[PDB]
Design an enzyme around this catalytic site. Structure first.
Site, PDB file in Angstrom:
ATOM      1  CB  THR B  43     -31.729  35.912  -8.187  1.00  0.00           C
ATOM      2  OG1 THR B  43     -30.385  36.319  -8.948  1.00  0.00           O
ATOM      3  CG2 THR B  43     -30.415  35.829  -6.951  1.00  0.00           C
ATOM      4  CG  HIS B  48     -32.434  43.791  -5.082  1.00  0.00           C
ATOM      5  ND1 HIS B  48     -31.589  44.378  -5.550  1.00  0.00           N
ATOM      6  CD2 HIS B  48     -32.563  42.105  -5.298  1.00  0.00           C
ATOM      7  CE1 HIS B  48     -30.799  43.642  -5.994  1.00  0.00           C
ATOM      8  NE2 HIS B  48     -31.180  42.397  -6.254  1.00  0.00           N
ATOM      9  CG  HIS B  51     -32.854  43.480 -10.002  1.00  0.00           C
ATOM     10  ND1 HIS B  51     -33.362  42.798  -9.131  1.00  0.00           N
ATOM     11  CD2 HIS B  51     -31.869  43.120 -10.223  1.00  0.00           C
ATOM     12  CE1 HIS B  51     -32.328  41.747  -8.592  1.00  0.00           C
ATOM     13  NE2 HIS B  51     -31.427  41.267  -9.651  1.00  0.00           N
ATOM     14  CE  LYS B  85     -23.701  38.321  -7.536  1.00  0.00           C
ATOM     15  NZ  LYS B  85     -23.181  37.240  -6.445  1.00  0.00           N
ATOM     16  NE  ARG B  89     -25.415  35.953  -9.418  1.00  0.00           N
ATOM     17  CZ  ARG B  89     -26.027  36.308  -9.947  1.00  0.00           C
ATOM     18  NH1 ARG B  89     -26.883  36.440  -8.367  1.00  0.00           N
ATOM     19  NH2 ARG B  89     -25.960  37.741 -10.376  1.00  0.00           N
ATOM     20  CD  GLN B 179     -26.745  38.235 -20.528  1.00  0.00           C
ATOM     21  OE1 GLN B 179     -26.850  37.425 -19.341  1.00  0.00           O
ATOM     22  NE2 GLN B 179     -26.332  39.083 -20.517  1.00  0.00           N
ATOM     23  CG  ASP B 200     -23.223  42.775 -13.448  1.00  0.00           C
ATOM     24  OD1 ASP B 200     -24.216  42.958 -14.594  1.00  0.00           O
ATOM     25  OD2 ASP B 200     -23.850  42.581 -12.244  1.00  0.00           O
ATOM     26  CE  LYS B 235     -24.465  44.631  -4.116  1.00  0.00           C
ATOM     27  NZ  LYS B 235     -23.902  43.807  -3.389  1.00  0.00           N
ATOM     28  CE  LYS B 238     -24.197  45.144   2.552  1.00  0.00           C
ATOM     29  NZ  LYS B 238     -23.028  44.470   1.897  1.00  0.00           N
ATOM     30  CB  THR B 239     -31.403  48.642   4.199  1.00  0.00           C
ATOM     31  OG1 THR B 239     -31.773  47.489   4.159  1.00  0.00           O
ATOM     32  CG2 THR B 239     -31.157  49.133   3.113  1.00  0.00           C
TER      33      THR B 239
HETATM   34  N1  LIG Z   1     -30.376  39.165 -23.521  1.00  0.00           N
HETATM   35  N2  LIG Z   1     -30.287  39.313 -22.688  1.00  0.00           N
HETATM   36  N3  LIG Z   1     -30.376  39.819 -21.509  1.00  0.00           N
HETATM   37  C1  LIG Z   1     -30.062  38.304 -20.599  1.00  0.00           C
HETATM   38  C2  LIG Z   1     -29.679  39.166 -19.419  1.00  0.00           C
HETATM   39  C3  LIG Z   1     -29.941  38.870 -18.080  1.00  0.00           C
HETATM   40  C4  LIG Z   1     -29.938  38.717 -16.645  1.00  0.00           C
HETATM   41  C5  LIG Z   1     -28.351  39.261 -16.595  1.00  0.00           C
HETATM   42  N4  LIG Z   1     -27.366  38.034 -16.693  1.00  0.00           N
HETATM   43  C6  LIG Z   1     -28.357  39.288 -15.163  1.00  0.00           C
HETATM   44  O1  LIG Z   1     -28.106  38.873 -14.473  1.00  0.00           O
HETATM   45  O2  LIG Z   1     -28.619  40.899 -15.259  1.00  0.00           O
HETATM   46  C7  LIG Z   1     -30.116  36.717 -18.522  1.00  0.00           C
HETATM   47  C8  LIG Z   1     -30.817  36.212 -20.034  1.00  0.00           C
HETATM   48  C9  LIG Z   1     -30.354  37.118 -20.839  1.00  0.00           C
HETATM   49  O3  LIG Z   1     -30.854  37.114 -21.924  1.00  0.00           O
END
Ligand SMILES: [N-]=[N+]=Nc1cc(C[C@H](N)C(=O)O)ccc1O
Ligand SMILES: [N-]=[N+]=Nc1cc(C[C@H](N)C(=O)O)ccc1O
Lengths: 322, 322
Positions: B43, B48, B51, B85, B89, B179, B200, B235, B238-239
């Site tokens: 993204t 950051h 994650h 969200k 995006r 995913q 999420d 949050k 977040k700054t």
């Molecule tokens: N498997 N798995 N986990 C994934 C995780 C992500 C990122 C996830 N959607 C996120 O926004 O945290 C993308 C692809 C994946 O296949």
């Protein structure tokens, strides 16, 4: 601001169920010949009577001077149109659908003129543009233009999403996007500005109109023919033995002629309007003639003769009597 | 029927928000080292603080002997995860995302051990299998396993489909399928039987569990870490100046250490559990020590030192003091 009477003429035959901005369409038709499209999916190795009204309507447009694009769904037939269907369509293999595509293209050809100058017919296959399209390109470049909130509200899939006894796969839910892009693609390459289709196609057609606006900023139109009904409430084109095929090897010309001879008195005059090129005046006079003749109605064998010749030509009409 | 205590241990750190069949997972973990995955989407050109918990949790699993698969979403980052969200995006270009993928892969590497025998880390990129996948193959082979009725009921997209002030593109609506297939693909090629993810991600993970069952008939598992909260309700991560990046060129090690020193007394002991490898016993003793010391709490600079070393190593910790 001249206006064409073509839509009015089709309306008097009872062939227009729905149409977008009729006034504007009629004006566009007066400007000059346009390219229009009608599509058919390879659900079988042949089309059947359920597909004949839209097919003949494409021919009615060519007779008025317009250019017909006969689209066969090499790609959409691998997905399945869920519009007003109670359950998922059978998924056929890539190999089989490609074979059926060629058969349908060949079956459709004789119905249109491919050698009459600039309004000569053109064959199209959406596998050309979807066959090798990558999924991310599809999801981004086409997908970003569709709102799921709007998609689940389309009448064509409403029952599938609302009735507890039904459901819809993501596969078929995506179909509306493929047919929508088909319109945009044909508009860009051939100048197609009108799509005509079966009675269950309004939503697929309007998605194409909106996507063509969003992608190419061109205003295009849509029209659907009516669901063909029988007075007795049963399904038209459905027999104990199944469908009435347009392929003479599946349903012989003799059997095809027999199907039409059997037409109900209540349906025959409406069917002459839907399935033949006889003028409204002649059909109206035939109904009046049968009303006061005291003889068996002539309408059934006139209908059988007309449609049999259209579908199987003079050879099939001759075969219907031996 | 032996049982691992790993899930219990993570639970005491408050790191397990949701987990599928915990008893069964704990038994599977006792059988021997497993391959598991955690994924990150490109993204931005860096991850950051938002994650970091899932990333460190992947490392916690490797420390217990399991094999971590660090997945970077070269394909999913071209679509966008709509989970919880409020709005679509931003769509980034293929060229830019591919560049960011390489940067994130490189940033993630130092956090895991790629040279410790059979549980050595492995990098994955879903662009490998989606980058050239044709759309019809996707819609048929993956798409037929998803019910739209079920998809619109997933909590992650509920507000987007129910609130009049929101909506979701077909593009982002399809993300859950990508995913989901990622899990099935990694299960087939690497024997991955567990996916861990952000707070999420429950629905995306469960779609992978179900699709892996439908495609390969293998039972796999899922676990999510919690949304990291601050006592004051704002949050985390977040700054005024935006995110706190893991890239030292974006957020210097000095600034990173300053962020942690500023941690609220109410959050610091919970944060030591989420962000460091100090034992629960040591963290509990530190909280007790700060309670009765009459001095400034040591917790904030212990946290700053621990996390700064984890993210920027000894060099960054030194830079935080000049
Ligand atoms: N498997 N798995 N986990 C994934 C995780 C992500 C990122 C996830 N959607 C996120 O926004 O945290 C993308 C692809 C994946 O296949
Ligand atoms: N354009 N157009 N019309 C189409 C029409 C079809 C067939 C249509 N869905 C039907 O089932 O009648 C397929 C693709 C098309 O693009």
């Amino acid at each position: 601001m001249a206006s064409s009477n073509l839509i009015k003429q089709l309306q008097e035959r009872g062939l227009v169920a729905q149409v977008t901005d009729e006034e504007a369409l009629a004006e566009r038709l007066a400007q000059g010949p346009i390219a229009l499209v009608c599509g058919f999916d390879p659900t079988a190795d042949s089309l059947h009577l359920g597909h004949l009204v839209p097919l003949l309507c494409l021919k009615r447009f060519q007779q008025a001077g317009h250019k017909p694009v006969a689209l066969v769904g090499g790609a959409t037939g691998l997905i399945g149109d869920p519009s007003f269907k109670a359950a998922e369509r059978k998924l056929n293999t890539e190999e089989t659908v490609q074979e059926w595509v060629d058969k349908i293209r060949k079956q459709v050809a004789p119905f249109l003129d491919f050698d009459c100058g600039e309004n000569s017919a053109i064959a199209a296959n959406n596998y050309d543009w979807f066959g090798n399209m990558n999924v991310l390109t599809f999801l981004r470049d086409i997908g970003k233009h569709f709102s799921v909130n709007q998609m689940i509200n389309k009448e064509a899939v409403k029952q599938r999403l609302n009735r507890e006894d039904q459901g819809i796969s993501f596969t078929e839910f995506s179909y509306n996007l493929l047919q929508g892009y088909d319109f945009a693609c044909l508009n860009k390459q051939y100048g197609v500005v009108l799509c005509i289709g079966g009675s269950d196609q309004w939503g697929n057609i309007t998605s194409g109109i909106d996507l063509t606006r969003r992608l190419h900023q061109n205003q295009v139109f849509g029209l659907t023919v009516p669901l063909i009904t029988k007075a007795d409430g049963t399904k038209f084109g459905k027999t104990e033995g199944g469908a009435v095929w347009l392929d003479p090897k599946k349903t012989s010309p003799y059997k095809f002629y027999q199907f039409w001879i059997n037409t109900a008195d209540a349906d025959v005059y409406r069917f002459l309007k839907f399935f033949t090129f006889m003028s409204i005046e002649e059909i109206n006079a035939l109904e009046e003639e049968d009303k006061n003749s005291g003889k068996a109605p002539r309408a059934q064998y006139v209908l059988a003769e007309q449609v049999t010749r259209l579908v199987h030509g003079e050879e099939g009409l001759q075969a219907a009597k031996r």
